[PDB]
Design a protein around this ligand. Sequence first.
Ligand SMILES: Cc1cc2nc3c(=O)[nH]c(=O)nc-3n(C[C@H](O)[C@H](O)[C@H](O)COP(=O)(O)OP(=O)(O)OC[C@H]3O[C@@H](n4cnc5c(N)ncnc54)[C@H](O)[C@@H]3O)c2cc1C
Ligand SMILES: Cc1cc2nc3c(=O)[nH]c(=O)nc-3n(C[C@H](O)[C@H](O)[C@H](O)COP(=O)(O)OP(=O)(O)OC[C@H]3O[C@@H](n4cnc5c(N)ncnc54)[C@H](O)[C@@H]3O)c2cc1C
Ligand SMILES: FC(F)(F)CNCC#Cc1nc(-c2ccc3c(ccn3CCC3CCNCC3)c2)sc1C1(N2CCCC2)CCCCC1
Ligand SMILES: FC(F)(F)CNCC#Cc1nc(-c2ccc3c(ccn3CCC3CCNCC3)c2)sc1C1(N2CCCC2)CCCCC1
Lengths: 487, 485
Amino acid sequence: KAFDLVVIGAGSGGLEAGWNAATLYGKRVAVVDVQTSHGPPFYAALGGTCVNVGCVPKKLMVTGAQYMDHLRESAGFGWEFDGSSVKANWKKLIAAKNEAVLDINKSYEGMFNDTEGLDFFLGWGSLESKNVVVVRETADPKSAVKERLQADHILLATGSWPQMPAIPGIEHCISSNEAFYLPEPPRRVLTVGGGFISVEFAGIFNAYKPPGGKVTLCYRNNLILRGFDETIREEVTKQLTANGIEIMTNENPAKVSLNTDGSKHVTFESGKTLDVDVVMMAIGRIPRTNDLQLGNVGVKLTPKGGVQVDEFSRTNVPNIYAIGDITDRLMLTPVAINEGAALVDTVFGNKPRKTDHTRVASAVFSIPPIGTCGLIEEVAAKEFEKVAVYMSSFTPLMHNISGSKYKKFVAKIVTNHSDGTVLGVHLLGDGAPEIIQAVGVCLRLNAKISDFYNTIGVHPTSAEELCSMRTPSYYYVKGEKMEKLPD
Amino acid sequence: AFDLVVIGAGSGGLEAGWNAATLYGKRVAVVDVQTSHGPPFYAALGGTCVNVGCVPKKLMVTGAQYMDHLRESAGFGWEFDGSSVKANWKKLIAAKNEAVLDINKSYEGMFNDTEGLDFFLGWGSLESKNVVVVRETADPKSAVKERLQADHILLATGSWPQMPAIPGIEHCISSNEAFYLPEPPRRVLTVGGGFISVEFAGIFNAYKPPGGKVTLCYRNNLILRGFDETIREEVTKQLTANGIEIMTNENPAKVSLNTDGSKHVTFESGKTLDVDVVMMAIGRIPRTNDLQLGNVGVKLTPKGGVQVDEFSRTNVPNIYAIGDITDRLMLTPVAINEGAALVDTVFGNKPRKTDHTRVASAVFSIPPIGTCGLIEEVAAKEFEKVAVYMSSFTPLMHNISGSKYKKFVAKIVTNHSDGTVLGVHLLGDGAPEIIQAVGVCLRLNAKISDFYNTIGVHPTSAEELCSMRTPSYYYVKGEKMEKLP
Ligand SMILES: Cc1cc2nc3c(=O)[nH]c(=O)nc-3n(C[C@H](O)[C@H](O)[C@H](O)COP(=O)(O)OP(=O)(O)OC[C@H]3O[C@@H](n4cnc5c(N)ncnc54)[C@H](O)[C@@H]3O)c2cc1C
Ligand SMILES: Cc1cc2nc3c(=O)[nH]c(=O)nc-3n(C[C@H](O)[C@H](O)[C@H](O)COP(=O)(O)OP(=O)(O)OC[C@H]3O[C@@H](n4cnc5c(N)ncnc54)[C@H](O)[C@@H]3O)c2cc1C
Ligand SMILES: FC(F)(F)CNCC#Cc1nc(-c2ccc3c(ccn3CCC3CCNCC3)c2)sc1C1(N2CCCC2)CCCCC1
Ligand SMILES: FC(F)(F)CNCC#Cc1nc(-c2ccc3c(ccn3CCC3CCNCC3)c2)sc1C1(N2CCCC2)CCCCC1
């Protein structure tokens, strides 16, 4: 079996590369993955982490969680019903999520069956030589060989995996993988970590918890969501707290033990203790390099765990490439897709293309959600002499009527004040993920603040706030925050 | 005397008045017929948008969307006593009224606390080229309250619902009265295919009592003329899917009262229909009749609008007109923009004119619409080679929500000679929020490549705009075809 391209990992980046190479350039492509559908024992499968245990199921479950707010908020608009009859059925949510993910799994299987020159191989891929991918029954190099795929080009696209801390009792904890299949919703749950996964699941568990429940989120440092706009970091903290979620900053689990009833007794480094039914570790994700036998061929890793690549996704070994989370840069599905498409254009279409990793728009599906693109102000302050910050914060009108007055919308714009170029936009509130997409197009066009405030607004929307800010709220000159420019 | 007298304390009038008083310290007078919302005049301090337009409409559509939320929650495991569910229209209106009144009071405070900015209650009209007379009523013979001497006069009285001349028209309401119905109508007929008719059809559909039915009729074949045709057809389907009856090629010919107070509607086709409310939403016309424009010779357009040049100047020197009274784009942000540009031009020697192209707008139907720029059939007449990029899909949540019919539609129209985006048209939840930043993109003359080379935000409906790289069909010399010749 001799192929133009062998892809290890049928995920976001791998599938884009395979589909493009086969359909746009008529190449013979083989793609390897460990399962054809979502779930245990391997969780990720055909379609990748995003489809199976990532963006897709997460979005469906956050959507379900939002109905706790919708039901309560409907009363302010005249909707009446027996509030004591409201119950949330977790099994129905999981079952419905499983059907939707499975429909995607089945669709991708049909893609392979019907696309000439695009073949799927079930098993574990690893590097035997520079031009041979071996597929084995299990991740263990001692397992039986299923196929040896001769490859002119090899693409490593195995994604990432939850990082689990080595504390006593870690075996009593779960990761996001298992959270997607919990048989019942935890009455008490501890989500460990300050990143988007911990925050998003905290909102899910908070909505579906049985009566007398409580969600606690802990984070080793002082403020959650490191890397996001600081104003938004503080606001989501308040709006999470306002919805019943306890946030434990400057705390970190030291050990976990079992109570007689099966619940978990958590002890933190500070000495505090907490009894919960589930402990979900979401402290990070690390590149999935352990099963590929990279040493057989000499593929180098970076000082971090990621496969080292240049801007064209080339490793140090000729004709072996790597994209997506395994490179440990921006762990986002659309980035992996773009890298895979650019790689195929470069290798097979003599159209050199490289992914732009700046000005990438992204979102956090907390409740309310975050939408962001570009630099935060403290980063821009170290790269530009004069930086201006335009800021607007307000409780939308519907939320004064709804009774959720804590739901303040935040809109921030960071600019290079020398010429007004927009460096970053940061949004908190309903619709922020949908708003920020086209803002990404604006930033690619090097839009200036005047391009925004001279655009006529759409009324009434939250987005029009971005076109209503023409005077900076404060500045950073040579890195120093100040309300007004010197002179 | 006054540097500026503004007739109409609405979107454009208040922007013009506020800017002139605070940015240039000019002495400004503003006239309006009411200080707070509601009958008999409905519009008041704050304009149509605040009192009987964008703001209350948005609140009431938000309330209407909960009918879908309550139903769709079941697909995600939520249950509750469905038989205990009631949509309390009176609570909605009461909540809406207090929100609008709070805005009325806010503008009331603005006038009291801003020097050089004064408000006069009454009906304004043109006595001469430098005199605005304020009377007690719209009747030109009613008692005079004030005579405002003005170096500059701004006409900003907005528009008014159009009503057809059919027997029994008096028994029909407009959008004005719809905001104050004491009870939600069990059976309602909304007349017209425009955005007001569609938006209120969804409001009435959500709050109607048991056994209710919303019917929308339009005199031609397809509602929402002027919007993208793919969206026009898909909106029709999704309105039908939610229980709204859409009567195309039908037009009321007469209305009479039944013995129970309901209305008996006879159509031109001979069909009949009994409803509790008939809402006329066939158009909006410039509100010029009460101004006595003949006293000074302000010329009107053949369609009834106050004729203005690019800087909002009438044919009479030092008399200007902005907003819906000009019969251009009847949008609040446009009126605001025209008002600010006028003041900058007149009182700041910084000539500014409003750009009326590539303006983003929205329809808060269920599902909503977001649009900016040209539709393809207009572009086809204006450009030799036009490409249309089209994508339809079911958002993830609607695979399990129980509303499979809620397709999201994304359309991009470009000048295929250079790929310049000429229009973007969206249908589905989030479209109003998505299209705002698209307006910034069109200002920057974004090309289709600028969209599909931008990395998407996943999972969102908006990322579909960055996923269309190949045209679905073209227009060449106005001729539709799948492939180029
Ligand atoms: C809970 C969660 C939520 C997320 N939400 C979002 C979001 O909202 N937006 C967003 O942009 N990103 C999100 N991400 C990130 C996104 O899922 C990843 O960045 C993206 O899936 C990376 O794709 P990839 O091609 O690098 O690898 P993946 O998509 O992870 O695909 C890797 C595939 O390789 C397979 N594989 C692994 N080892 C082998 C082997 N030896 N042989 C054969 N196959 C193998 C796996 O089964 C897997 O299917 C989320 C991630 C998580 C965990
Ligand atoms: C139901 C509905 C929904 C709408 N929704 C939207 C939307 O979502 N988005 C959007 O952009 N636009 C919307 N519009 C349009 C928007 O309301 C108008 O385009 C905007 O208000 C125009 O403002 P203006 O300054 O032209 O006049 P207006 O804001 O209408 O103000 C005119 C004012 O002048 C006063 N007046 C009139 N005659 C006299 C007189 N003789 N003397 C003194 N005062 C007088 C009136 O009382 C009124 O307050 C909607 C309109 C309606 C009817
Ligand atoms: F939520 C998700 F967004 F994740 C859902 N998945 C998105 C997708 C997809 C997709 N499905 C394809 C698909 C799916 C099924 C298919 C075929 C070809 C044949 N079949 C099955 C046959 C049936 C019946 C005949 N009509 C076509 C479908 C293609 S190709 C494809 C694209 N991607 C490439 C790889 C990643 C996704 C192709 C390029 C444009 C964007 C989407
Ligand atoms: F539809 C909306 F809901 F959006 C309407 N509200 C929008 C607004 C406003 C606004 N309010 C003002 C306002 C409102 C109240 C004010 C003052 C100055 C003094 N006051 C009184 C404040 C007192 C304080 C005590 N409590 C009573 C009110 C100013 S000035 C003003 C702005 N425009 C002015 C005219 C049109 C809008 C100013 C320029 C930026 C846009 C908004």
